[PDB]
Amino acid sequence: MALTPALKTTLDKVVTSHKVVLFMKGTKDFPQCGFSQTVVQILKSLNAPFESVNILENELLRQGLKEYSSWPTFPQLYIDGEFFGGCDITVEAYKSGELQEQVEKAMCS
Known part of the structure; x- marks a missing residue:
């Protein structure tokens, strides 16, 4: 199956290319x-980008992201x-x- 060799590898490439990721x-x-x-508007308004990945495009996302x-x-939400x-x-x-602190921590690392 693609979950472990390709999909989690793609998610890691997305997470390292873009610091804020959404699963919805x-x-x-x-x-x-x-x-x-609400989650998207909060992060945006704190002052940040976001990558919303659609969970319903693949059953390996819908099951594996849990x-x-x-x-x-x-x-x-993932950061x-x-x-x-x-x-x-x-x-x-x-x-x-606490989100404001942890999203700032996600920016500075």
Whole structure:
């Protein structure tokens, strides 16, 4: 199967080429409303880019991105080689200053 030799290799190339990555049911050119749009708008507004990868384009993404993090369900936020979690975690952390700190940490490494 392509998951371990090619797909995780592609995700690592995406993660190292672009420091902020989103896993959701849409792309950066065609987003989805609610949780995904909220997570995307928060990161954008903090002052940052984002690479939204569409999970529904391949069953190896839809199944494998749960194990790539260890976090259950989507949308899922990922930064500079580590996952952050879902929209509820993102919204409470942005209000608490913890996402702001960790996204700045994802920029400086």
